[PDB]
Amino acid sequence: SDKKTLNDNRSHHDFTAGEKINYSIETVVPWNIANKKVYTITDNPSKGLIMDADTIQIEGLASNKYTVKKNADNGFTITIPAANLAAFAGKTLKTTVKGHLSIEDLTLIDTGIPNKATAKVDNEAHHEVKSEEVFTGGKKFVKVDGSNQSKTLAGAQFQLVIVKNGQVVKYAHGNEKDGYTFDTNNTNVATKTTGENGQFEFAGLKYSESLEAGESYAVKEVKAPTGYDLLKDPVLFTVTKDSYKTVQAADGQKISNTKKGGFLP
Ligand code: NA
Ligand code: NA
Protein backbone atom coordinates (compact mmCIF):
# COMPACT_ATOMS: atom_id res chain seq x y z
CA SER A 1 0.00 0.00 0.00
CA ASP A 2 1.02 3.68 -0.08
CA LYS A 3 3.79 5.15 2.06
CA LYS A 4 5.68 8.36 2.69
CA THR A 5 9.17 7.94 4.15
CA LEU A 6 11.53 10.40 5.81
CA ASN A 7 14.94 9.45 4.43
CA ASP A 8 17.13 10.13 7.48
CA ASN A 9 19.25 7.29 8.89
CA ARG A 10 19.65 8.71 12.40
CA SER A 11 17.98 7.95 15.68
CA HIS A 12 17.12 11.66 16.10
CA HIS A 13 15.33 13.65 13.37
CA ASP A 14 16.37 17.20 14.25
CA PHE A 15 17.02 19.84 11.56
CA THR A 16 17.99 23.49 11.41
CA ALA A 17 15.53 25.77 9.70
CA GLY A 18 16.25 25.83 5.95
CA GLU A 19 18.15 22.49 5.89
CA LYS A 20 16.88 20.11 3.25
CA ILE A 21 14.84 17.10 4.35
CA ASN A 22 14.55 14.17 1.96
CA TYR A 23 11.29 12.26 1.43
CA SER A 24 10.04 9.42 -0.71
CA ILE A 25 6.36 8.93 -1.57
CA GLU A 26 5.26 5.54 -2.92
CA THR A 27 1.74 5.26 -4.30
CA VAL A 28 0.04 2.33 -5.96
CA VAL A 29 -1.07 2.61 -9.55
CA PRO A 30 -4.10 0.39 -10.16
CA TRP A 31 -4.42 -2.39 -12.72
CA ASN A 32 -7.11 -0.41 -14.52
CA ILE A 33 -5.35 2.99 -14.65
CA ALA A 34 -5.59 3.09 -18.47
CA ASN A 35 -9.38 3.21 -18.16
CA LYS A 36 -9.29 6.19 -15.74
CA LYS A 37 -8.86 9.93 -16.42
CA VAL A 38 -6.45 11.29 -13.80
CA TYR A 39 -4.01 10.32 -11.05
CA THR A 40 -3.41 12.99 -8.38
CA ILE A 41 -0.89 13.18 -5.53
CA THR A 42 -1.49 15.93 -2.99
CA ASP A 43 1.15 16.69 -0.37
CA ASN A 44 -0.12 18.37 2.79
CA PRO A 45 2.85 19.21 5.05
CA SER A 46 2.13 19.96 8.70
CA LYS A 47 2.65 23.54 9.86
CA GLY A 48 6.33 24.45 9.94
CA LEU A 49 7.26 22.25 6.98
CA ILE A 50 7.61 23.70 3.44
CA MET A 51 7.78 21.39 0.43
CA ASP A 52 10.17 22.39 -2.34
CA ALA A 53 8.03 21.83 -5.44
CA ASP A 54 11.01 22.36 -7.80
CA THR A 55 12.65 19.17 -6.36
CA ILE A 56 9.96 16.62 -7.29
CA GLN A 57 11.13 13.69 -9.41
CA ILE A 58 9.07 10.63 -10.35
CA GLU A 59 11.03 7.50 -11.16
CA GLY A 60 10.46 6.48 -14.75
CA LEU A 61 8.23 9.46 -15.60
CA ALA A 62 9.62 12.56 -17.35
CA SER A 63 8.62 16.03 -16.10
CA ASN A 64 6.66 16.71 -19.31
CA LYS A 65 4.17 13.90 -18.37
CA TYR A 66 2.70 15.59 -15.31
CA THR A 67 1.94 18.97 -13.80
CA VAL A 68 3.11 20.31 -10.43
CA LYS A 69 1.15 23.07 -8.69
CA LYS A 70 2.28 24.75 -5.45
CA ASN A 71 -0.51 25.14 -2.92
CA ALA A 72 -1.40 27.60 -0.16
CA ASP A 73 -0.55 25.15 2.66
CA ASN A 74 3.06 25.03 1.36
CA GLY A 75 2.52 21.61 -0.21
CA PHE A 76 1.76 20.76 -3.80
CA THR A 77 -0.42 18.77 -6.17
CA ILE A 78 0.96 16.46 -8.88
CA THR A 79 -1.59 15.82 -11.66
CA ILE A 80 -0.91 12.95 -14.06
CA PRO A 81 -3.11 12.11 -17.06
CA ALA A 82 -4.04 8.49 -16.52
CA ALA A 83 -2.91 7.50 -20.04
CA ASN A 84 0.61 8.52 -19.09
CA LEU A 85 0.63 5.80 -16.41
CA ALA A 86 -0.43 2.87 -18.62
CA ALA A 87 3.01 1.17 -18.29
CA PHE A 88 2.74 1.48 -14.48
CA ALA A 89 -0.52 -0.46 -14.11
CA GLY A 90 -0.35 -2.63 -10.95
CA LYS A 91 2.99 -1.15 -9.87
CA THR A 92 4.12 1.42 -7.29
CA LEU A 93 5.02 4.95 -8.39
CA LYS A 94 8.00 6.42 -6.59
CA THR A 95 8.18 10.18 -6.11
CA THR A 96 11.09 11.87 -4.37
CA VAL A 97 10.92 15.42 -3.00
CA LYS A 98 12.68 17.68 -0.53
CA GLY A 99 11.25 19.95 2.12
CA HIS A 100 12.62 22.25 4.78
CA LEU A 101 11.46 23.80 8.05
CA SER A 102 10.37 27.45 8.20
CA ILE A 103 9.02 28.51 11.57
CA GLU A 104 6.52 31.39 11.69
CA ASP A 105 5.00 30.26 15.03
CA LEU A 106 7.50 29.66 17.82
CA THR A 107 5.12 27.25 19.54
CA LEU A 108 6.30 24.79 16.85
CA ILE A 109 9.84 24.63 18.29
CA ASP A 110 10.41 21.25 20.01
CA THR A 111 7.33 19.70 18.40
CA GLY A 112 7.14 16.86 15.86
CA ILE A 113 6.28 17.93 12.32
CA PRO A 114 5.23 15.19 9.81
CA ASN A 115 4.74 15.34 6.08
CA LYS A 116 1.45 13.91 4.75
CA ALA A 117 0.32 12.92 1.27
CA THR A 118 -2.80 11.47 -0.41
CA ALA A 119 -3.04 9.81 -3.82
CA LYS A 120 -6.36 9.76 -5.71
CA VAL A 121 -7.52 7.94 -8.85
CA ASP A 122 -10.29 9.95 -10.51
CA ASN A 123 -12.47 10.83 -7.47
CA GLU A 124 -11.44 7.89 -5.31
CA ALA A 125 -8.90 8.70 -2.62
CA HIS A 126 -6.37 6.33 -1.18
CA HIS A 127 -5.79 6.61 2.56
CA GLU A 128 -3.53 9.50 3.64
CA VAL A 129 0.04 8.54 4.43
CA LYS A 130 2.39 10.24 6.89
CA SER A 131 6.15 10.35 7.31
CA GLU A 132 8.05 10.28 10.56
CA GLU A 133 8.12 13.58 12.40
CA VAL A 134 11.03 16.02 12.25
CA PHE A 135 11.98 18.49 15.00
CA THR A 136 13.90 21.71 15.45
CA GLY A 137 15.21 23.20 18.70
CA GLY A 138 16.48 26.42 20.16
CA LYS A 139 18.01 28.25 23.11
CA LYS A 140 17.00 31.27 25.21
CA PHE A 141 19.42 33.65 26.96
CA VAL A 142 19.38 36.61 29.33
CA LYS A 143 22.02 39.34 29.46
CA VAL A 144 22.77 40.29 33.08
CA ASP A 145 25.23 42.16 35.30
CA GLY A 146 27.98 39.73 36.40
CA SER A 147 28.03 40.95 40.01
CA ASN A 148 24.25 41.40 40.27
CA GLN A 149 22.75 38.68 38.09
CA SER A 150 19.21 39.93 38.87
CA LYS A 151 19.87 43.06 36.80
CA THR A 152 18.96 42.53 33.13
CA LEU A 153 20.61 44.64 30.44
CA ALA A 154 19.33 46.36 27.28
CA GLY A 155 21.26 47.14 24.14
CA ALA A 156 23.55 44.11 23.91
CA GLN A 157 23.93 42.56 20.48
CA PHE A 158 24.85 38.90 19.97
CA GLN A 159 25.73 36.93 16.85
CA LEU A 160 25.13 33.19 16.40
CA VAL A 161 28.39 31.41 15.57
CA ILE A 162 30.03 27.98 15.64
CA VAL A 163 33.32 27.42 17.53
CA LYS A 164 35.85 24.58 17.13
CA ASN A 165 39.44 24.18 18.28
CA GLY A 166 39.35 27.44 20.21
CA GLN A 167 38.24 29.59 17.29
CA VAL A 168 35.10 30.94 15.69
CA VAL A 169 34.90 28.78 12.52
CA LYS A 170 31.44 29.65 11.13
CA TYR A 171 28.96 32.52 11.26
CA ALA A 172 25.21 32.08 10.95
CA HIS A 173 23.07 33.98 8.46
CA GLY A 174 19.30 34.12 8.35
CA ASN A 175 16.68 33.23 10.93
CA GLU A 176 14.12 30.53 11.90
CA LYS A 177 11.67 31.63 9.14
CA ASP A 178 13.96 32.36 6.23
CA GLY A 179 16.35 29.54 7.19
CA TYR A 180 19.92 29.58 8.39
CA THR A 181 23.19 29.11 6.60
CA PHE A 182 26.59 28.85 8.27
CA ASP A 183 29.86 29.78 6.52
CA THR A 184 33.15 31.65 6.98
CA ASN A 185 31.73 35.07 5.97
CA ASN A 186 31.68 37.42 8.99
CA THR A 187 29.17 39.85 7.46
CA ASN A 188 25.36 39.92 7.53
CA VAL A 189 25.55 37.70 10.61
CA ALA A 190 22.38 36.52 12.41
CA THR A 191 22.18 38.93 15.37
CA LYS A 192 19.76 39.72 18.19
CA THR A 193 19.52 42.82 20.37
CA THR A 194 18.30 42.86 23.99
CA GLY A 195 15.67 45.15 25.45
CA GLU A 196 15.33 46.10 29.10
CA ASN A 197 14.42 42.52 30.12
CA GLY A 198 17.80 41.27 28.78
CA GLN A 199 16.19 38.50 26.74
CA PHE A 200 17.23 37.09 23.40
CA GLU A 201 17.09 33.68 21.72
CA PHE A 202 17.99 31.67 18.65
CA ALA A 203 15.32 29.23 17.52
CA GLY A 204 15.17 26.76 14.64
CA LEU A 205 18.52 25.01 15.38
CA LYS A 206 19.31 21.32 15.23
CA TYR A 207 20.63 19.68 18.38
CA SER A 208 24.28 20.05 19.36
CA GLU A 209 24.72 16.30 18.98
CA SER A 210 24.05 16.77 15.24
CA LEU A 211 26.91 19.27 14.74
CA GLU A 212 30.19 18.11 13.15
CA ALA A 213 32.76 16.62 15.48
CA GLY A 214 34.36 19.23 17.68
CA GLU A 215 31.84 21.99 16.94
CA SER A 216 29.74 23.91 19.46
CA TYR A 217 27.16 26.62 19.07
CA ALA A 218 28.08 29.89 20.70
CA VAL A 219 26.84 33.46 20.91
CA LYS A 220 29.35 36.28 20.30
CA GLU A 221 28.72 39.72 21.79
CA VAL A 222 29.32 42.46 19.21
CA LYS A 223 27.81 45.39 21.12
CA ALA A 224 27.94 45.77 24.90
CA PRO A 225 25.03 47.09 26.98
CA THR A 226 25.50 50.72 28.05
CA GLY A 227 28.06 51.02 30.84
CA TYR A 228 29.63 47.56 30.20
CA ASP A 229 32.75 46.09 28.58
CA LEU A 230 32.41 44.08 25.37
CA LEU A 231 32.97 40.38 26.14
CA LYS A 232 36.31 39.05 24.93
CA ASP A 233 35.20 35.53 24.06
CA PRO A 234 32.10 33.75 22.76
CA VAL A 235 29.60 32.13 25.10
CA LEU A 236 29.03 28.42 24.43
CA PHE A 237 25.58 26.83 24.59
CA THR A 238 23.92 23.48 23.98
CA VAL A 239 20.69 22.67 22.08
CA THR A 240 18.87 19.46 23.07
CA LYS A 241 15.35 18.14 22.69
CA ASP A 242 13.11 20.49 24.69
CA SER A 243 15.86 23.00 25.59
CA TYR A 244 13.70 25.81 24.10
CA LYS A 245 10.09 25.06 24.95
CA THR A 246 10.52 24.03 28.58
CA VAL A 247 11.91 27.39 29.82
CA GLN A 248 10.31 30.82 29.95
CA ALA A 249 12.37 33.49 28.25
CA ALA A 250 13.23 35.14 31.60
CA ASP A 251 14.83 31.81 32.66
CA GLY A 252 17.19 31.72 29.68
CA GLN A 253 20.89 30.98 30.09
CA LYS A 254 22.41 33.94 31.96
CA ILE A 255 25.33 35.77 30.35
CA SER A 256 27.39 37.94 32.71
CA ASN A 257 28.71 41.40 31.78
CA THR A 258 31.26 43.57 33.59
CA LYS A 259 31.03 47.35 34.04
CA LYS A 260 33.40 49.69 32.25
CA GLY A 261 34.51 53.26 32.65
CA GLY A 262 33.11 55.98 30.39
CA PHE A 263 34.64 58.47 28.02
CA LEU A 264 34.78 62.25 28.02
CA PRO A 265 32.59 63.82 25.33
NA1 NA B 1 4.38 8.47 -5.84
NA1 NA C 1 8.54 15.10 8.56
Side-chain angles (χ1 to χ4, degrees), residues 1-231 233-265:
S1 178
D2 300 0
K3 187 180 194 184
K4 183 175 183 175
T5 307
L6 170 67
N7 299 317
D8 185 31
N9 188 39
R10 297 181 296 148
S11 63
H12 46 101
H13 300 299
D14 54 304
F15 291 82
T16 294
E19 282 186 326
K20 299 307 191 189
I21 309 167
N22 290 299
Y23 298 98
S24 298
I25 302 167
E26 295 173 88
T27 59
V28 174
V29 179
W31 60 278
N32 60 340
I33 192 60
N35 207 31
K36 299 295 185 174
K37 293 195 172 301
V38 59
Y39 192 98
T40 308
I41 302 165
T42 305
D43 192 301
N44 297 294
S46 298
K47 289 185 177 178
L49 175 63
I50 309 302
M51 304 309 291
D52 294 296
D54 57 293
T55 72
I56 290 163
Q57 297 184 117
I58 303 181
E59 191 174 304
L61 192 68
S63 63
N64 72 336
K65 300 297 188 174
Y66 60 91
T67 300
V68 176
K69 176 67 171 68
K70 182 84 170 179
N71 298 323
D73 71 346
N74 311 126
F76 58 78
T77 302
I78 299 165
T79 305
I80 318 177
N84 294 350
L85 292 176
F88 296 78
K91 307 179 142 78
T92 297
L93 194 72
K94 184 174 172 164
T95 302
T96 53
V97 64
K98 300 186 181 346
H100 62 274
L101 297 179
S102 175
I103 306 304
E104 300 176 68
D105 176 357
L106 288 167
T107 71
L108 293 168
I109 304 298
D110 287 325
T111 75
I113 304 171
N115 188 42
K116 309 181 294 301
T118 304
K120 183 177 63 177
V121 180
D122 289 353
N123 293 136
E124 287 186 335
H126 295 183
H127 304 286
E128 181 177 63
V129 293
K130 202 148 37 82
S131 71
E132 285 169 298
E133 294 172 1
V134 301
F135 292 79
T136 193
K139 190 72 183 181
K140 299 176 184 172
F141 307 89
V142 185
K143 181 87 275 289
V144 302
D145 177 276
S147 302
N148 177 19
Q149 287 203 317
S150 313
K151 177 58 177 184
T152 61
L153 304 176
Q157 294 172 4
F158 284 85
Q159 291 181 166
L160 176 64
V161 303
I162 307 296
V163 294
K164 178 166 164 173
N165 292 326
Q167 303 291 332
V168 174
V169 295
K170 297 167 184 168
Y171 299 87
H173 311 283
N175 60 59
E176 69 286 356
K177 178 180 185 303
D178 299 319
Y180 296 98
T181 62
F182 295 78
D183 64 27
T184 62
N185 169 29
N186 179 23
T187 66
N188 304 133
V189 182
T191 308
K192 303 298 169 69
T193 301
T194 67
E196 278 297 342
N197 68 14
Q199 292 165 21
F200 69 101
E201 60 188 46
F202 289 101
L205 298 179
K206 73 191 181 190
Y207 302 159
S208 298
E209 70 170 323
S210 296
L211 292 179
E212 273 197 59
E215 290 184 351
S216 180
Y217 294 121
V219 294
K220 175 186 172 183
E221 201 182 56
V222 295
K223 185 178 167 55
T226 302
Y228 289 84
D229 200 40
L230 187 68
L231 292 174
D233 299 306
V235 177
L236 279 60
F237 69 93
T238 302
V239 178
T240 61
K241 179 185 190 64
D242 296 343
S243 59
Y244 182 90
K245 85 166 171 196
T246 62
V247 296
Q248 292 184 339
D251 292 317
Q253 174 175 326
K254 293 184 158 64
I255 304 177
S256 290
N257 288 272
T258 303
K259 291 191 169 202
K260 191 192 185 182
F263 70 92
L264 297 164

